[PDB]
Amino acid sequence: VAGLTPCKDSKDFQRRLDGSVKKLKTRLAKYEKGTPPALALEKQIERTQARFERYGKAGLLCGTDGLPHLITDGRWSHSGEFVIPGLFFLYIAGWIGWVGRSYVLFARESDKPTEKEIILDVPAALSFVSTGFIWPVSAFKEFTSGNLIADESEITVSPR
Amino acid sequence: MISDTQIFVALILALVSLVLAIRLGTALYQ
Amino acid sequence: TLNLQIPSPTFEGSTGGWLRAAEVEEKYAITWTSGKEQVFEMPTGGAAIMRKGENLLYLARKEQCLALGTQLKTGFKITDYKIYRIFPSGEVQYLHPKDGVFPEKVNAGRIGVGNVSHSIGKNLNPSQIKFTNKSFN
Amino acid sequence: MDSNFLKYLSTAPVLLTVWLSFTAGLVIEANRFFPDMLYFPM
Amino acid sequence: AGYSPVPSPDNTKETYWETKAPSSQVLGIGKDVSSGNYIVASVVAAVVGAACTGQCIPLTVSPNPVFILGSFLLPYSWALHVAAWIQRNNGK
Amino acid sequence: SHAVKVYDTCIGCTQCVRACPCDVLEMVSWDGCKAGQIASAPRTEDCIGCKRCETACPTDFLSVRVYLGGETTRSMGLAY
Amino acid sequence: MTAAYLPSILVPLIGLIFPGFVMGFAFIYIEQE
Amino acid sequence: TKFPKFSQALAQDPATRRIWYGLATAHDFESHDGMTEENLYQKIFASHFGHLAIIFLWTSGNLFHVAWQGNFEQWVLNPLKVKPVAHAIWDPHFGQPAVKAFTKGGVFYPVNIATSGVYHWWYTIGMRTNNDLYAGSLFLLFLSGVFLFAGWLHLQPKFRPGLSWFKNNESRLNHHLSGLFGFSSLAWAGHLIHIAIPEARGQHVGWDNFTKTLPHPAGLTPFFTGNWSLYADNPDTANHIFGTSEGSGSAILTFLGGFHPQTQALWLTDIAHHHLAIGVVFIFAGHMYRTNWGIGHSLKEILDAHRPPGGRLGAGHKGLFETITNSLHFQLGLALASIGVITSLVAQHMYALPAYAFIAKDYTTQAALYTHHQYIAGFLMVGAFAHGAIFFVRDYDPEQNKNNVLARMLEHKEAIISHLSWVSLFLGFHTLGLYIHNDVVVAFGTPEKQILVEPVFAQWIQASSGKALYGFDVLLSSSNSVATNASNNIWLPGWLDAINSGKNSLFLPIGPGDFLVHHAIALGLHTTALILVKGALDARGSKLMPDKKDFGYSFPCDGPGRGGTCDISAWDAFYLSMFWMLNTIGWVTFYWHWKHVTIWQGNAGQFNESSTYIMGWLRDYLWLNSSPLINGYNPFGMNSLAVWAWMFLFGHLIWATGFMFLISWRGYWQELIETLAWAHERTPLANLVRWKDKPVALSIVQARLVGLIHFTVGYVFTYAAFVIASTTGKF
Amino acid sequence: VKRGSQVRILRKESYWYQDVGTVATIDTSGIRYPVVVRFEKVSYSGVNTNNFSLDEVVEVV
Ligand code: CLA
Ligand code: CLA
Ligand code: CLA
Ligand code: CLA
Ligand code: CLA
Ligand code: CLA
Ligand SMILES: CC1=CCCC(C)(C)[C@H]1/C=C/C(C)=C/C=C/C(C)=C/C=C/C=C(C)/C=C/C=C(C)/C=C/C1=C(C)CCCC1(C)C
Ligand SMILES: CC1=CCCC(C)(C)[C@H]1/C=C/C(C)=C/C=C/C(C)=C/C=C/C=C(C)/C=C/C=C(C)/C=C/C1=C(C)CCCC1(C)C
């Protein structure tokens, strides 16, 4: 609706579905019924039909090409297209980074940090992996306590 | 449409510009 | 001084030896005493047999002469190798064991050339030495 | 189990291979049971 | 260090400031104008420029030259009020 | 020729002198380092620019620096 | 003598004579003491 | 030797490096022996005179060849049917088939067809006969002579300028804004009113007629009465045949907007009004700075005064006056960056808004011009950053720039570089990932699984400008908006007519393929900027070589110590950015050319559908459009495109040759040339001849430069062939 | 500063500039760069030790 048409009611989308199904059926016509190839092609047809129907009902918009297009501007009617998926990413990525940083510090305060970085201490690594589930509040706590950002006078820098 | 006399006037102006370019090249080479 | 009558290490010949530039510009020489007849590697390529006694060898480059000297010093235990440079005029000069002692050990008499009285961080900037004769030192 | 063998299994390439194989299996099974998810359903 | 001296126009003064406000030499010909004068000028310029702009927003093919001229007072009023603040914190 | 220079940071390790394929660096006497010796570059006209001296230097920033300058037969290592 | 002859008169000059003379003179200049 | 007379260090080199480096350092005056600042500036002045003379001679040659061997007079009759010929071909290598294949201009001799658009340009200006072009060429020859004489004269002892004159910023700025820009554009408006518009209306006006021919029936009374609107009354009708009096008006200054219907270019009256307006604006701007009188500003005062009291910039702009005035490299970088931006703008605006008559229908000309100016833009930007780095190495004075914006840039260079690197990785990772996702799904036969993001932001900007294709109703798409109501009676009618017709390139419709290629362009710009900025900021020193300013700008390396220091120079950063700049301009021009080709053939759906995966570009753009080019010559004959096919292969060859210098490095070649010298000296009958310069291998920096040059020439020639030949073979 | 003390480097050209090391020895003979600092981080050249002056090192807390 933004600048395109709903995909549930687009002749282009219907034509693409028809073409895919017809290709699969032409491939199926040369195989005996009940044979593994026939069953596989039938399952492919079912998967194609389910995918197209679900895309139609999802509320996705489709252009003249007959393919779904994504509205990644912030509109709440299309949040599931970029924003919620991206929030899940950011959660997982902050988890990974936070636990990795924690393990780096843990290995830093060890007898052999390099040995701990090549041959890992997987009990402690799994500990940190577990901790990573509240990484947003933990990272902000580190920031505000001053344990995250290092001072300008304590970081090596090249001469000007 | 462009006559030989016209082409010759153009060539003469080109020669003058070449002389001046040689002069400038000398003065720059110094 | 250099004695041009010292025999040579009975080399069989190579295409890595000196060329016309040796006869025109500079030709280096190395002399060393050997206690026995060993087989060494020429800096130009190939094997040669050094003689029992003094051996003189001609090369095109001081680096070749010094590589041969390093081979003698490390592989063998010969450290009396002297290096000379010869010009077409016959101006043979003396270079290695310059003062008779190798440079790796301090010796009284040398004068420091190229020494600076600060760390590299104290060098001036090209903007400061631009359109001037000052040195970045 | 031998502690030396366990340290070998704790070495970086073994852990990276096992962890990324586990992650690949996770993604593959997610796509096997919930395929063609071009969007979060809302 | 061997660079030739940089020529600058006549009567070039030092305008660098780390004080609360510049030195009023920044205002040039208007350095001796009062802060109240700058305030009144800024208000009058803003009002006149806004009025002359509104008289020209649906621009016709024959706009009034005086309205065009006066519309340039809205941008002028900004500099005038900046000068007012500068001149209030420099003693005037 | 290349310009080879030594600085106060020298510690007299002599590895710069021993690493030189030519004979450009020699040890001289000094009082600024425990070893009492400093590197010097008298035969800079034989320098080739390999920077082996620079490689064999243990001080944070090198005490010996080679600034590659004009090229000659000896600097270019031309046996011809 | 018309202008149509000028291409055939000049292209060989500009493309074989001018480059040859320039190369010879520049050779003499660059290798000269 | 005395070839590199400006360097004894090179004159005493016994090898071929002397010749090579004398070539490559001839114009680095600062590094020359005994170079003073006065001599530097005066030599630069004379060289500028010579460069202007060269440009004038080049344009004069263009005009002369179009006048002599051109078909301008028979092109001004049916410009949409006749191909414009650049110059005749005289090659003694052509066969009869080639001569016949190149006699396409209806001229009875082999010719080249111009792709520069000079025909359309001159026709719009007012040139109609070959005598006009010949007179222009004569004048430009005279001007080249005048400027050569000026260059020679200003090197004379009593005419050599002084440094107090060269460093006079205010007078030069005033004169360049007022006279060079302002009065020059005012004079262009004068030309457009006295010659171009009458010529476009069929009334010849020249040196013998312009002093008796009124540009307007009212004369100058409407000007000297304040009734300026009389100069916009009666514009040219929509049925005006350019160059004839049918449909013409009498207006000389207008703001109709949009494009002339028949010519499909901007109104000449609009252009004249544009130039007059910017002329008066520039004349006013050129009265800002102080000169021999009391009025005006001083740039030093302004720069020093501009420091935010919050202190977030430190000393603000203190010392920048001296820095810029004393550093020619700072000025060079600023000029190069600005000219690069402006030439990119020229490319963009000149296609979206054509100004010359019938140029839009010359498809090969438009593509050639766009590619030309984009490549020039990229070169200029790379040069601007390179000279910024050179300034940092050579002309930067920290004590002078004590805690001003420049010293602060140097202070947080690490933050700048790291964040630029992060944004580069961000863009690259995700753009390439989306492209690969689309590729894999389309390959598996599920194009409906592609991630296609609508460029809603750019579509919104288009709609704000007045495009109704996308339903947004924002500012000018909205009929009740204040923006619409403000300009409804000046330019909006024509502008909307232009924006909302699909017959032009003004604000082309965009889609997910455009989105993806735009983010590829963002990646390219950001990575080129990353390399260049890192080079500039680390030019003075890094943690690996903390004394780089001592070694300069373009040293080879620092040896294999400290892990290896290959390509540790700011010149190397330039060398590495140049690869990326070429990549990015290649992406930009690929995008432009494919979109416009598809639109021109009317199958824009092909781009809309295939632009979303890289196989689409490889198949439907390169493979599909290379057919006529690669068939320029074949076992069954040849056509005029044979030259472009040959140059296509030529570019491939030189590109791959540059790969040699870029992958193979010096030591191998030096140990090979040693054996070659041995063989020559040892060969009878050839040892009678000897080299005067010892044959040596190429230097490290020299090899990098030669490989880069070969790579660049191949890049440019290959794409120039492809674009011109494919456009000419498809249309 | 004394032996076995943490000192932050203040030499700009140093690989360990604004980084902390441990003083191993301080020579009172009167040489240019008496203090000797060991570091856990190796430099590009592979050395984890250096000689510094008393003005290029500051004790940390
Ligand atoms: C751009 C300039 C240019 C010009 C004007 C020419 C002209 C010519 N080339 Mg071409 N050529 C050029 C560049 C040029 N070439 C380049 C850059 C290359 C390198 C790829 C070649 C490689 C090349 C080859 C391999 C051949 C030609 C040949 C030819 C001839 C054309 C065919 C024919 O029937 O003539 C042939 C008929 C003749 C009667 C030839 C007479 C030529 C007279 C003697 C020339 C006078 C030379 C002059 C005295 C030398 C002055 C030296 C001074 C500058 C120092 C003609 C002489 C063909 C040929 O036969 O050349 C001899 C030929 O086989 N050319
Ligand atoms: C008008 C602008 C301008 C000006 C005045 C200068 C001026 C200068 N530049 Mg340059 N520069 C510019 C633009 C400009 N640059 C641009 C746009 C770039 C980016 C590409 C550069 C990149 C650049 C670098 C990286 C360097 C300079 C350097 C210099 C200085 C020395 C010039 C030199 O060595 O000559 C060179 C002389 C030549 C004859 C050039 C030879 C190579 C060219 C490119 C020809 C190759 C094309 C080939 C012949 C075509 C074949 C055709 C085919 C069909 C066969 C000098 C102050 C150097 C310097 O001194 O820095 C401190 C330096 O290192 N510049
Ligand atoms: C299936 C889809 C998919 C895939 C395969 C990837 C893959 C990738 N993404 Mg991700 N990304 C996705 C979807 C996806 N993305 C979506 C939908 C979004 C929109 C929200 C993003 C937004 C995103 C960002 C913002 C970044 C990436 C980055 C990356 C790359 C490195 C991630 C990493 O190292 O994590 C391991 C985690 C870490 C190393 C920790 C540090 C980095 C994370 C991302 C910080 C997260 C928390 C932080 C507070 C967020 C601030 C963001 C703000 C500054 C904008 C990797 C190639 C990173 C990249 O390209 O860097 C060059 C990166 O910075 N992605
Ligand atoms: C710079 C512009 C320019 C260019 C690129 C060309 C190109 C050409 N001209 Mg020339 N030409 C020019 C200006 C130019 N012309 C001018 C201004 C005139 C009028 C005097 C002529 C008159 C002319 C004639 C009469 C003929 C050519 C021909 C040709 C062709 C072969 C070269 C030749 O014989 O030159 C010969 C040129 C001259 C005798 C005089 C003009 C020389 C110009 C002014 C040199 C300018 C040099 C430039 C500014 C700086 C050099 C840069 C440096 C790095 C090399 C070729 C297409 C010939 C051909 O076969 O055409 C199909 C031919 O018959 N031209
Ligand atoms: C297609 C060729 C190519 C590619 C992919 C890259 C990639 C990169 N270059 Mg570039 N570069 C190239 C050619 C290329 N370059 C060339 C020819 C040159 C001239 C010498 C340069 C010179 C150059 C310089 C000088 C710089 C870059 C930089 C970059 C980065 C840009 C940011 C980016 O896109 O991050 C996104 C990353 C990618 C697109 C690559 C990821 C590849 C895959 C998709 C990731 C997944 C790996 C996979 C799981 C492995 C499985 C295989 C395994 C089993 C063996 C990135 C690493 C800059 C940089 O490092 O900035 C951070 C930089 O400074 N490049
Ligand atoms: C297309 C790319 C290209 C080209 C042209 C070459 C060319 C060459 N390479 Mg190779 N090389 C390449 C890529 C290329 N390389 C790459 C990418 C690498 C990196 C891996 C290398 C690495 C490499 C090595 C390590 C070696 C070579 C060698 C050679 C030489 C082989 C024998 C020879 O001289 O043939 C001569 C033939 C040609 C150069 C073909 C083009 C010449 C045409 C046919 C004639 C044109 C002349 C024309 C008339 C001139 C007119 C000028 C003017 C009038 C316009 C030759 C110079 C070997 C060598 O030198 O051994 C002898 C060698 O040791 N190359
Ligand atoms: C035509 C005619 C009519 C009747 C009488 C006459 C005998 C004269 C007869 C013959 C005339 C003849 C033979 C004319 C010849 C014409 C010629 C030689 C034309 C060539 C002109 C060349 C020109 C411009 C070249 C310009 C080059 C320039 C700027 C180069 C710039 C520079 C460069 C490249 C390096 C640094 C120095 C400088 C100068 C800045
Ligand atoms: C006016 C208008 C119309 C339509 C709506 C819109 C919102 C667009 C509105 C506003 C438009 C605006 C604000 C446009 C902005 C464009 C801008 C800011 C363009 C600037 C581009 C900057 C460039 C290349 C910078 C290149 C920098 C270079 C080489 C630097 C080199 C240097 C280095 C590396 C070392 C020091 C010396 C030096 C020479 C400085």
Automatic annotation (TrEMBL), chain D:
TM regions (residue ranges): 12-34
SUPFAM superfamilies, sorted: Subunit IX of photosystem I reaction centre, PsaJ
Listed Pfam families: PSI_PsaJ
UniProt keyword annotations, A-Z: Membrane, Photosynthesis, Photosystem I, Plastid, Thylakoid, Transmembrane, Transmembrane helix
Localization annotation: Cellular thylakoid membrane; Membrane
Biological-process GO terms, alphabetical: photosynthesis
Main location: membrane
Coiled coil: none
The family this protein is said to belong to: Belongs to the PsaJ family.
Protein name per its UniProtKB record: Photosystem I reaction center subunit IX
Species of origin: Chroomonas placoidea
Automatic annotation (TrEMBL), chain F:
Membrane-crossing segments per the record: none
All copies of domain 4Fe-4S ferredoxin-type, residue ranges: 1-30, 38-67
Predominant location category: membrane
Assembly and interaction partners: The cyanobacterial PSI reaction center is composed of one copy each of PsaA,B,C,D,E,F,I,J,K,L,M and X, and forms trimeric complexes. The eukaryotic PSI reaction center is composed of at least 11 subunits.
Protein name: Photosystem I iron-sulfur center
Cellular localisation: Cellular thylakoid membrane; Plastid thylakoid membrane
UniProt keyword terms in alphabetical order: 4Fe-4S, Electron transport, Iron, Iron-sulfur, Membrane, Metal-binding, Oxidoreductase, Photosynthesis, Photosystem I, Plastid, Repeat, Thylakoid, Transport
GO biological process: photosynthetic electron transport in photosystem I
Gene Ontology CC entries for this record: photosystem I; plastid thylakoid membrane
Enzyme Commission number: 1.97.1.12
Catalytic activity: reduced [plastocyanin] + hnu + oxidized [2Fe-2S]-[ferredoxin] = oxidized [plastocyanin] + reduced [2Fe-2S]-[ferredoxin]
Gene behind this protein: psaC
UniProt-recorded Gene Ontology molecular function terms: 4 iron, 4 sulfur cluster binding; electron transfer activity; metal ion binding; oxidoreductase activity
Automatic annotation (TrEMBL), chain G:
InterPro entries: PSI_PsaI, PSI_PsaI_sf
The keyword Membrane is annotated on this UniProt entry: yes
Organism superkingdom: Eukaryota
Xref: Pfam families: PSI_8
GO CC field: photosystem I; plastid thylakoid membrane
Membrane disposition: Single-pass membrane protein
Entry keyword set: Membrane, Photosynthesis, Photosystem I, Plastid, Thylakoid, Transmembrane, Transmembrane helix
UniProt keyword Transit peptide present: no
Listed transmembrane segments: 6-30
GO annotation terms (biological process): photosynthesis
Subcellular location, record wording: Cellular thylakoid membrane; Plastid thylakoid membrane
SUPFAM superfamilies on file: Subunit VIII of photosystem I reaction centre, PsaI
Family of the protein in this entry: Belongs to the PsaI family.
UniProt function note: May help in the organization of the PsaL subunit.
Name listed for the protein in its UniProt record: Photosystem I reaction center subunit VIII
Species, as recorded: Chroomonas placoidea
Automatic annotation (TrEMBL), chain I:
HAMAP family assigned: PSI_PsaE (MF_00613)
Descriptive protein name: Photosystem I reaction center subunit IV
Protein role: Stabilizes the interaction between PsaC and the PSI core, assists the docking of the ferredoxin to PSI and interacts with ferredoxin-NADP oxidoreductase.
Keywords: Membrane, Photosynthesis, Photosystem I, Plastid, Thylakoid
Cellular localization per UniProt: Cellular thylakoid membrane; Membrane
Keyword Thylakoid on entry: yes
Recorded family membership: Belongs to the PsaE family.
Xref: InterPro entries: Elect_transpt_acc-like_dom_sf, PSI_PsaE
GO cellular component labels: photosystem I reaction center; thylakoid membrane
Membrane topology reported for the UniProt record: Peripheral membrane protein
Example GO biological process: photosynthesis
Organism this protein belongs to: Chroomonas placoidea
